[PDB]
Amino acid sequence: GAAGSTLDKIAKNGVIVVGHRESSVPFSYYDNQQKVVGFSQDYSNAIVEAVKKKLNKPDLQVKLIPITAQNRIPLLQNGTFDFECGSTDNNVERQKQAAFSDTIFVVTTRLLTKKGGDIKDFANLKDKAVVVTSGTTSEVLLNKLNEEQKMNMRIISAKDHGDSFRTLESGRAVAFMMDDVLLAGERARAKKPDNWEIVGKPQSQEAWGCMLRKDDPQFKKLMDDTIAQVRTSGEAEKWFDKWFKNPILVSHNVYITADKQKNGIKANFKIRHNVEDGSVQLADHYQQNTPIGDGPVLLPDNHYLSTQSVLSKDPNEKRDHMVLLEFVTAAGITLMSKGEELFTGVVPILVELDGDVNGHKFSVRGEGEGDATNGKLTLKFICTTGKLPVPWPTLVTTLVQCFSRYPDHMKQHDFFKSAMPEGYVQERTISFKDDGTYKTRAEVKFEGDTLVNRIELKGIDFKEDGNILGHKLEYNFNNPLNMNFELSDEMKALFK
Amino acid sequence: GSTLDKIAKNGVIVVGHRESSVPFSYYDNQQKVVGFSQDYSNAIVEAVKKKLNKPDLQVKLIPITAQNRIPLLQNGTFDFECGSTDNNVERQKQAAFSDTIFVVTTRLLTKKGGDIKDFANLKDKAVVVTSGTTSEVLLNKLNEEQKMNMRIISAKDHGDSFRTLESGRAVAFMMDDVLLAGERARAKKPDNWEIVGKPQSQEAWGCMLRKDDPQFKKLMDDTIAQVRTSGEAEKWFDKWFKNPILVSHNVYITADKQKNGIKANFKIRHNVEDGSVQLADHYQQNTPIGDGPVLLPDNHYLSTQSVLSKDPNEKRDHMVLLEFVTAAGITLGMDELSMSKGEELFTGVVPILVELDGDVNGHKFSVRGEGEGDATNGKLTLKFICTTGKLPVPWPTLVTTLVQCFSRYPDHMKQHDFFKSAMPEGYVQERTISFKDDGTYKTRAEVKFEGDTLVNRIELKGIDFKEDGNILGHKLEYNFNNPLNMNFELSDEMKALFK
Ligand SMILES: N[C@@H](CC(=O)O)C(=O)O
Ligand SMILES: N[C@@H](CC(=O)O)C(=O)O
Ligand SMILES: [Mg+2]
Ligand SMILES: [Mg+2]
Ligand SMILES: [Mg+2]
């Protein structure tokens, strides 16, 4: 058979081509910024890093390409990609065409259906439209059940799992059959996740592995070693808790460019606020910052800030309020001044905002602390004038980028700290799609030991029953997904 | 101390600028401060950098108005300003002036075909003027001396003054004639407006600086003299007054290392025939067609300008395009005052073929373009034809869809040129273009060499467009980059100045 390895081909070419799935949630799927993410993609990344160390090629490139259940094996055999980790069952029939790593997940094949409907088990599918994803194990099982039991099902074959779920969600099928965890994943992305139930006696139990070409023991050994190390280091259980037991967030990217004319910077970015009906409210941000002082600043090369925030409520606070936890890291440039020295400890923060939106006047006061070493903010905001006339999430970006974590190799690009203590003016236009606009002007500076953000906000042209003045936005940030899925006994055994 | 002493101490020169003195010192639609006088301001800054041996001197532009320019100069809030300030004896008591950079007369702007033919026609009428200007003094003086009973509306800056006139809330706007021509150029309908009236005065503009600083005055006067005799002053006049003024677009690029590619985002503003603007938000992702190594960039941007024209011998629906693109956003380092194989494919002139098939709200169409690209100069020249008859969308909405491998990457940035590095195998370019209050284009293109020709083959799908919106309604001007075209003669006094 083969005398060489895909590892030798990778080393020659300088790139590893990795297949990935498009809608295997939360394992290998596109997030709303088209990043390929998930539990299996974490294994894929670990394997890629293991290939880089094994080949001593620290600058190896990666090229992720999309595959489907239908085309994964033909594209593997003709060399279109080198391996994939996503949601592929290891079985005997497939071992005739491909090789598999050791198992990374174990599932059972079940049904997703509307809560409170007639579908309790597979027997309820008689004479009904049932959706299943083309090219999958469940498609084979569902057709076989339909034929062997003469159930008169109308089996709809959809191109990928999100399409299958949206067939169910729109009423064109009474149930979706698939791996139970993938049903839970599509449910998490639904308009109303809590309307959907997993039901039915399992038709099978399956084990997922990474797929690679046959006759490559060196590459499979590197994968199996990597999987073994992920387990015994505790990372496998930590990745499970990450994807299945905590909110899954999508980072925002604040794109920064120098504005040398003004000795400052500009930025642009988009926020997508979740709407209660399952849609999204786009908020387009334009930003300009100029230093208050007339001394030197750091004028950055282009880069971006990667941001995630968590909103919560203080159970002992009766005023209208928001508790905020925020994490920000600078990126976009590949690998002590006075201003930067001001941020080496924990710095108290004060925020004051005076707002007028469509004539509705309000004020907000916030206090907390920031830890730029860790890119971390913790703040509590109160509406001091009574009820806030807009949703708290629409004010998050307005309510101190000097607390971003700049990596050591990027510290010469940190405009925000360099303007301290005298500070900077931050101005934004925030354009809400199909609705009004906020215009903001803030001064961010030190007053004594405290970092103060004092803002004026003016909002115009809002729709009184739109998503903002109508209070139709969910109290969250970064478009969370929250899985509802039990750690099974089989998975517990896998982790030993 | 002196102004240079302050600049040297701080490492920053603080430059006052006007906000609406068109086309001398004004904000363009990307908030950049531009104009004929700002070209002088930049020349002065560069002379200060050279004099102080501080190539990394920083610049801080701060806005000033006709009302606050002198007090902010006096208390040191800024160091100098080049804009539109008259030099006169009264102001010399408060400030020093450079040698003259422009000469104007004070006149009126009014609606073409109206009753305002000269200053006498203003009797009993509303007249607008900018607060704190020479014209405001002259207009009030004329009012009282000739008992004209004008209602003088005093607006905060020249754009506000003009929009008072444009919106019918005054019958005329008095100002420096060239500033009237500048505000006209930005109007909803520039050709509706006429400059009339016997000049009330002739004025000379200079750059303002603090009094009793002869060395800083000499640096500015020396720079202004060099601009004249080097011919730059006449070239700047031609640039600002006899050629279209464009705004550049910035294409903001970030790496997408997962896909061995890049993403980009940027905004295009299309001029609408009624004077409004149609926003087109661009999201972009590129991936290499080949599986071999590429250049993965740090964040940077492409600075783009385009000129659309018509071929007078072409009877088909068509667009002639000239485009210039330069990469920017990574500073040339103090210590430095081919990176891919594909880069070598662009050292000379490369022929280009573009093929687009479109479907917008069910209206199908095809476009074919041919021309050539010169990446050494960041320059493209193409002619496009609609091969299916009439184009069902405006040509400007297709410009961004219809080869960023022809961008000029400065030498210090060549390691960030993903586009050329993916050749000859090429790349896939996908976009979502969202037209504000209207529909969306989704595009997928392959850009690659086919033999010696760089080929861009595109599929475009448009949905949710309004049939009477700006796109399907064909309400967009045939231009790009939001041009302004001055209508202003070179006077004999300006010719004298250029000697
Ligand atoms: N695990 C199933 C479904 C999938 O791949 O998404 C299969 O291997 O066919
Ligand atoms: N040139 C006039 C108007 C202006 O400054 O814009 C003045 O000096 O007041
Ligand atoms: Mg939801
Ligand atoms: Mg009199
Ligand atoms: Mg126009």
From TrEMBL, chain B:
<protein>
    <submittedName>
        <fullName>Periplasmic binding transport protein</fullName>
    </submittedName>
</protein>
<dbReference type="Pfam" id="PF00497">
    <property type="entry name" value="SBP_bac_3"/>
</dbReference>
<dbReference type="InterPro" id="IPR001638">
    <property type="entry name" value="Solute-binding_3/MltF_N"/>
</dbReference>
<feature type="binding site">
    <location>
        <position position="84"/>
    </location>
    <ligand>
        <name>L-glutamate</name>
    </ligand>
</feature>
<keyword id="KW-0732">Signal</keyword>
<feature type="binding site">
    <location>
        <position position="134"/>
    </location>
    <ligand>
        <name>L-glutamate</name>
    </ligand>
</feature>
<dbReference type="GO" id="GO:0005576">
    <property type="term" value="C:extracellular region"/>
</dbReference>
<feature type="binding site">
    <location>
        <position position="86"/>
    </location>
    <ligand>
        <name>L-glutamate</name>
    </ligand>
</feature>
<keyword id="KW-0813">Transport</keyword>
<dbReference type="GO" id="GO:0030288">
    <property type="term" value="C:outer membrane-bounded periplasmic space"/>
</dbReference>
<feature type="binding site">
    <location>
        <position position="158"/>
    </location>
    <ligand>
        <name>L-glutamate</name>
    </ligand>
</feature>
<comment type="similarity">
    <text>Belongs to the bacterial solute-binding protein 3 family.</text>
</comment>
<dbReference type="InterPro" id="IPR051455">
    <property type="entry name" value="Bact_solute-bind_prot3"/>
</dbReference>
<feature type="binding site">
    <location>
        <position position="69"/>
    </location>
    <ligand>
        <name>L-glutamate</name>
    </ligand>
</feature>
<feature type="binding site">
    <location>
        <position position="18"/>
    </location>
    <ligand>
        <name>L-glutamate</name>
    </ligand>
</feature>
<dbReference type="GO" id="GO:0006865">
    <property type="term" value="P:amino acid transport"/>
</dbReference>
<feature type="binding site">
    <location>
        <position position="66"/>
    </location>
    <ligand>
        <name>L-glutamate</name>
    </ligand>
</feature>
<feature type="disulfide bond">
    <location>
        <begin position="82"/>
        <end position="207"/>
    </location>
</feature>
<feature type="binding site">
    <location>
        <position position="91"/>
    </location>
    <ligand>
        <name>L-glutamate</name>
    </ligand>
</feature>
<feature type="binding site">
    <location>
        <position position="176"/>
    </location>
    <ligand>
        <name>L-glutamate</name>
    </ligand>
</feature>
<feature type="domain" description="Solute-binding protein family 3/N-terminal">
    <location>
        <begin position="12"/>
        <end position="244"/>
    </location>
</feature>
